[PDB]
Amino acid sequence: YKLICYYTSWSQYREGDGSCFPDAIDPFLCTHVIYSFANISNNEIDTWEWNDVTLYDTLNTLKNRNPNLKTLLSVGGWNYGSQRFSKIASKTQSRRTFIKSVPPFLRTHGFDGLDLAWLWPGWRDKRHLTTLVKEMKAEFVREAQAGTEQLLLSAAVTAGKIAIDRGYDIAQISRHLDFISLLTYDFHGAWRQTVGHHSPLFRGNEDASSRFSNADYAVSYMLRLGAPANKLVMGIPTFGRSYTLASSKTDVGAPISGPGIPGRFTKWKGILAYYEICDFLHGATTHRFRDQQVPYATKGNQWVAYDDQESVKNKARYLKNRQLAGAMVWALDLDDFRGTFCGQNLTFPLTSAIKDVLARV
Numbered sequence: 001y002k003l004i005c006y007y008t009s010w011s012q013y014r015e016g017d018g019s020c021f022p023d024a025i026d027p028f029l030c031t032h033v034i035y036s037f038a039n040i041s042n043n044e045i046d047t048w049e050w051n052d053v054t055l056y057d058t059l060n061t062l063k064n065r066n067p068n069l070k071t072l073l074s075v076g077g078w079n080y081g082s083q084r085f086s087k088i089a090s091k092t093q094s095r096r097t098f099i100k101s102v103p104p105f106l107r108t109h110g111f112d113g114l115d116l117a118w119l120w121p122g123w124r125d126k127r128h129l130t131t132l133v134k135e136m137k138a139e140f141v142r143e144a145q146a147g148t149e150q151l152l153l154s155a156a157v158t159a160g161k162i163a164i165d166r167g168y169d170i171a172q173i174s175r176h177l178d179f180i181s182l183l184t185y186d187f188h189g190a191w192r193q194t195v196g197h198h199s200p201l202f203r204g205n206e207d208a209s210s211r212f213s214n215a216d217y218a219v220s221y222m223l224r225l226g227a228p229a230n231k232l233v234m235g236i237p238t239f240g241r242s243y244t245l246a247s248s249k250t251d252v253g254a255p256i257s258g259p260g261i262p263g264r265f266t267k268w269k270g271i272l273a274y275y276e277i278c279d280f281l282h283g284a285t286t287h288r289f290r291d292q293q294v295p296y297a298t299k300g301n302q303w304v305a306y307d308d309q310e311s312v313k314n315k316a317r318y319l320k321n322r323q324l325a326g327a328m329v330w331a332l333d334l335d336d337f338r339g340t341f342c343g344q345n346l347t348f349p350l351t352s353a354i355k356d357v358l359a360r361v
């Protein structure tokens with residue numbers, strides 16, 4: 001059972017206790033930790049932040065304490081243009097230059113593999129992603145002839161049905177990747193002028209135009225498209241999404257005015273860390289969608305959709321019974337990593353809760 005965990009660069013800037021460094025990570029917690037995000041420059045992989053070299057270094061020391069722990073570097077991200085990626089992939093003289101630069105960069109900084117986070121390929125891009133993945137794995141295989149352990153190659157693949165069909169040749173790229181992580185936590189957002197959950201586990205016989213909007217369907221679809229179970233990994237969020245209510249309506253369907261106010265530490269409209277959520281929960285109204293099996297809370301004119309220990313453990317049994325490769329967690333820095341905000345004295349409450357399910361029968 002794999003446990004892929006993401007650590008984000010920009011989390012170091014958060015003030016006070018918000019501050020997170022590779023330091024805070026417990027070496028036995030996950031199986032793979034992925035540094036997010038690298039940058040591309042002069043058609044070559046390159047760092048992003050100024051002090052990345054230092055952080056790459058800090059993160060890869062964890063391996064001193066745990067030899068079986070593998071790390072990967074992710075290229076892409078949202079704040080990276082899909083356009084830019086699209087440009088390097090369609091012109092063979094740019095693609096090859098990009099591909100050739102990776103083994104060397106990873107080896108230098110002590111990474112065990114590369115994670116492709118192209119968000120998102122357009123209908124014109126599908127053919128070029130397959131090529132990138134194909135040639136990139138070919139290069140990794142050729143490099144192993146030098147007597148070193150073959151690099152891993154993974155991909156972050158979005159979970160909305162329409163998104164998938166547009167730009168991913170699932171059957172094709174699955175034979176080349178080592179694992180695929182399904183972003184099963186972006187099923188709703190402020191862009192829909194109503195209140196709703198972004199990571200429901202099941203459909204819930206309530207509404208029926210978006211039956212493709214839940215983890216369960218996404219997983220089944222991917223399996224039908226040809227991805228082997230032993231390579232699929234399900235995404236579990238550690239954050240929640242917030243919304244400013246536009247009325248006094250709190251139930252399903254309720255009207256929205258826009259995203260929620262920023263968190264004291266994460267400072268971002270519409271997002272909240274689990275540890276910020278734990279604070280918000282005090283004097284908040286406790287609610288839970290029984291059909292879909294995820295919780296939401298509301299206080300004043302704020303409405304928050306999030307995941308707690310019970311829902312996360314529930315998602316974990318699901319991937320187990322369906323026999324998937326494992327779980328992916330976005331992101332370690334949004335969990336209560338110090339273990340002092342969510343009552344119980346436990347660091348990484350959410351991620352450990354997952355591990356507990358994955359670690360038993």
Ligand SMILES: *[C@@H]1O[C@H](CO)[C@@H](O[C@@H]2O[C@H](CO)[C@@H](O[C@H]3O[C@H](CO[C@H]4O[C@H](CO)[C@@H](O)[C@H](O)[C@@H]4O)[C@@H](O)[C@H](O[C@H]4O[C@H](CO)[C@@H](O)[C@H](O)[C@@H]4O)[C@@H]3O)[C@H](O)[C@H]2NC(C)=O)[C@H](O)[C@H]1NC(C)=O
Pocket residue numbers: 039040041042047048049
């Ligand atoms: C991730 O990598 C990205 C890709 O490199 C980084 O993007 C860089 O962004 C900067 C600022 O946003 C851009 O800025 C430069 O603006 C002009 C743009 O013209 C150029 O880019 C062409 C791309 O190939 C080159 O062919 C040209 O030579 C030219 O550089 C630059 O020219 C400016 O500076 C330089 O200009 C001349 C070049 O002859 C020199 O004489 C100067 O002394 C100076 O060196 C700016 O640097 C840039 O487009 C862009 N990409 C590149 C190739 O660097 C991005 O910053 C990074 N992300 C983060 C946040 O780290």
